[PDB]
Amino acid sequence: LTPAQALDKLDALYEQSVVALRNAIGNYITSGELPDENARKQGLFVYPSLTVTWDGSTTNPPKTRAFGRFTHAGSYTTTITRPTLFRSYLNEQLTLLYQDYGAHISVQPSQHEIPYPYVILDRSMSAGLTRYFPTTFSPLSHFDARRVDFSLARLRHYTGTPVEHFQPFVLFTNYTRYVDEFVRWGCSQILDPDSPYIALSCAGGNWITAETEAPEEAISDLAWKKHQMPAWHLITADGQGITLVNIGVGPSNAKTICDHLAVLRPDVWLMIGHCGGLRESQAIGDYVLAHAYLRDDHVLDAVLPPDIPIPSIAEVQRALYDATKLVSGRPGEEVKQRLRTGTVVTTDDRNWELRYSASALRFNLSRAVAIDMESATIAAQGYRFRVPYGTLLCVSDKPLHGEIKGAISEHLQIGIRAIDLLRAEGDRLHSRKLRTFNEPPFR
Amino acid sequence: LTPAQALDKLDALYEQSVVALRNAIGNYITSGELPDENARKQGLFVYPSLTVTWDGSTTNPPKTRAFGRFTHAGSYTTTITRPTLFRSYLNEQLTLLYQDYGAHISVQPSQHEIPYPYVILDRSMSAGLTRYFPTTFSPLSHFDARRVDFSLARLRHYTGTPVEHFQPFVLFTNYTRYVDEFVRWGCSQILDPDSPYIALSCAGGNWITAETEAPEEAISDLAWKKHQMPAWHLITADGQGITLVNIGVGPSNAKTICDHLAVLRPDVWLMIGHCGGLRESQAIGDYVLAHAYLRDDHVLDAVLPPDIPIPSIAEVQRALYDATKLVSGRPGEEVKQRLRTGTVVTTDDRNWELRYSASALRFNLSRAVAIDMESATIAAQGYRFRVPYGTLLCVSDKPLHGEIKGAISEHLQIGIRAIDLLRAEGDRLHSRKLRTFNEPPFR
């Protein structure tokens, strides 16, 4: 069975089950009719199952590639959802295993039923539905159908945007003004015929395009009230645009959003936000490129102990560095005056200043250069879900030197230019630094 | 007071006290005569004291330099030992503060007496000596006279080498064969009139030079029997040679040697040794460039908690990388097949294999690429003492894939070439990644 064939059968089996489930739900709601146990046990409401086998024999397999590899011979399977949404991804991944290892692809109904909430009111019916309907050999991919549907639903909820509009290159900010600037620059790019950017999905619903009646409707103020972490997508025909998510504040929220965004398998996400500068030689407006993180955020301690080192992705580091040279003033070694590369402390205690003594030893021990509340969490999540990551913050205050609580446009530009550099980079973006011993074949 | 003047007064006060102490000791040994309390209380056996003051006013001070900087106005002092041995260092450091800040230098006797053992019997004398003789602002430097004398004495003991022969660029190895190769290459370089290398200090005493009668006396086999960590110095006229220390095995020993070597203020130390490859795609003989460390060595947990991130020094990382391209085969992106960049696990349990299950979770969580017993320790110590560091290991076995327990020359060459690249690098070697908030002015 081939890639194109596998995709088509997945679409078929999936479409069939969702329709069969929607059908049964309608029947129950109108005539209190229930589905037959036999049909269900036969895959009536089941997710498609994708299996890929490898015999182990191959001339010279990709020993250096970061993804799309086999660590051993055997069968790798996974339930699948929304094949259309994941068409590109699934195609590309299956193609790599097909052409580089001559793997045996096969599709068939799984043993897992689709929870009815994902195929769609009242509350009395809620009692019956949950009673008679579905509610809530190595891994071929990181997440299974259940986990993916779970996160897609949630993404829309926190983002106020359809998941089909998310681009592979993500930018995260903890400062509102950045989206204003992003949207402005975005609309501007859409009007330029030479720019690949043809649309702008906005949190709330707005869909700005070149044929739009007064693109002022871009930023809906009501967006921040109904969505915890509003997103904005600058789309391109080939889906290689830029997504910007205003994550808000705190490690808790940073963890939450990454938990979901991870299922879309981004190519990279960068943290472009504010931070407090801890060094006297630092000036408000300066940049900090994190080369390491002092994880005082707690939120991920249980799944990733604080002593597990979270490294820097060299490719992303150069990108941020180079992009900073270009956009910010003249290049050379002069950047040093405006850019500091060092360790960033991420805390879950905004008011850490009320306890400086207790913190001072840590800052000193870590040679801390800046402090924020999202960096380490985003980076750690990137690391956990094999999503290249990077952090370039901008000093907005100097807590330790009597300057507690513009460069916005420039800062955002550095982020965007970095994206550009990484996009052209092609596959050099992905390395083996994030690969696990039991790494799934799919990227 | 000027740099040259300060150095001269330091030499004087120091020379005087050591002679005065040596004198008093001889008098006691021969005639049981004791020193007079008044003279001592007047600085008879005291170390010289170096004080540097800064008013705070200066046009535009070095805001980007890694060392020789003032974080605030005030006086910085420190006791000093062996001014001749530290002549270059002290001169350079004082010149920087003198010319860039117009700092006020001053020398005077301290309140600290030189422990008699450092200026050099039955149980009867030792009893008297320790009874009647000395026994064992902001800081201007990292270590004080007592701490420095303590380490110099120890360095000679573990190394079997005079401290005056140590060079600024250090190489560490946990494999004996590396010194054989190093000495061979070393003697070879001494015979070449175009090579800056003019001498080779050897563990045990040997001093090979171009005018030597059969330089076969180089490696004294008795060296490993009388010295725990034998060193070899390839010296140059300007003292910019290469020092190689065979550290032996274990985190304990790695910690010990660095504790002392740190007082000589090296420019950099690289770990060039063996390790176990943890990945199936790794082949014996491949190289591992550490970008992070999983500190399971324990030995430094109390002074530097395992959650404090130990970063990579970019400059050292590139030098190790480039040096690997040059020396090892052809350049390009092909290095990837021979070189893996990733996280190294340093353990204090050589037989960790006897407990794979317990370890496996850690290896996986850290994306471990290799495992040794000294790396993280050496790097952590470098970090602690502000000594740029780096690690480039060579896979000598594959514990997880059966194969358990020429390239040596190549490996060593990579280390040496890296040193060369860093030496030419000049000051770009030192960055601010290791600076503390209360960083002493002296490098």
Added chain:
Amino acid sequence: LTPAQALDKLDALYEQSVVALRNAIGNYITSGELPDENARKQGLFVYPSLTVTWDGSTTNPPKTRAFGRFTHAGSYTTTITRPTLFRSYLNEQLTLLYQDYGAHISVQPSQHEIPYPYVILDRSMSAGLTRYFPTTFSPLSHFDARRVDFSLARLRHYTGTPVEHFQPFVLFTNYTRYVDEFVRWGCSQILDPDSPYIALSCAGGNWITAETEAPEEAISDLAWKKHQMPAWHLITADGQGITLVNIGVGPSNAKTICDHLAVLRPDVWLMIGHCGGLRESQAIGDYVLAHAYLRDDHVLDAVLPPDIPIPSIAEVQRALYDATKLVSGRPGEEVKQRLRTGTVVTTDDRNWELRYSASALRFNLSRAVAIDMESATIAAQGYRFRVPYGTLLCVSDKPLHGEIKEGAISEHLQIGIRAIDLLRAEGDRLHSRKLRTFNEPPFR
């Protein structure tokens, strides 16, 4: 089946499999030929299996013996390797269970194949070998064939000595000069016709005997360069000599060496080395007999938590004490002036002095008397592997009293040797129940 019979069948089955494996390896290397799955599944490359059963019925079994006992009825099994090397041991152990409990012995092929590396080319073969060949009830013994072969190979590597030269009485030292003194005394004993010592296996290869051409070749200086922990064996006809291992420095190394030496089932191992004296009344050259250890070595925390008490073996303690009286002058309570019995601190931080304050509280809390870097580790390992242990250190410095870093070396080593003698004559009184676990394997 009887002891002698079991030994013979073990030798047979083992010899057969090793030869069968060596054969298959040769075939692959020369003709790329692979073994047949059926033969292997039939015990072609398999280790012998030793099983001992007990019905539970017996007049009056040894209720006080430290080893060779049954806690309950049932079958006890274990894979076995190098039956020749372990002939004495295996025979003695099987004899005890046979005659004291009338146990049912039986030998047969196991389900475990011998990893090819233990029966010993190039690099392009390593890939194939590891692909087509074997790579790297209740237990009858502490270690199985896999674990034993693993350690034997390693012992030779760290020691620079063939495993069959190791004696039951082991001495550990962290000071080079002790081997010089040991070898000297050793050669001397070999020349004396009244001494049971007939040979001296040396690290590196040398095999000194009475018929040797200038026994100066004893200590090969190159030994410390090619072997991390050089050993020296003073052998006797009945293999009851003394083995000396120069372990070097650190808890890591102390742990490593004991991990391997334990499979040879020593009768005892003593730590005879230097330490720092922490008491003002202590004089350089004094002795310290450890009655307890403050484990600040870390290296064994995971498998043996620091709060599990590591006790002193009374028999070993008396031997060390008496030996000290004899060798170090006259007996009586006059030893007190030269010998202090107390708690020893074992750390993995040689430069602990750089943090005295942080340590002071601990030293004080434990009534610490000395500090070193190997004792607690050696002792803990002995405890873990049921190998009687003891520590008698010699103060080489006084870190806390201005005396920071030999005739006494010879005396110290003599105390160690005399202690061994006392323990050797002690017979079985050496082994007690203080090290027995609830699920203790029948074999010593």
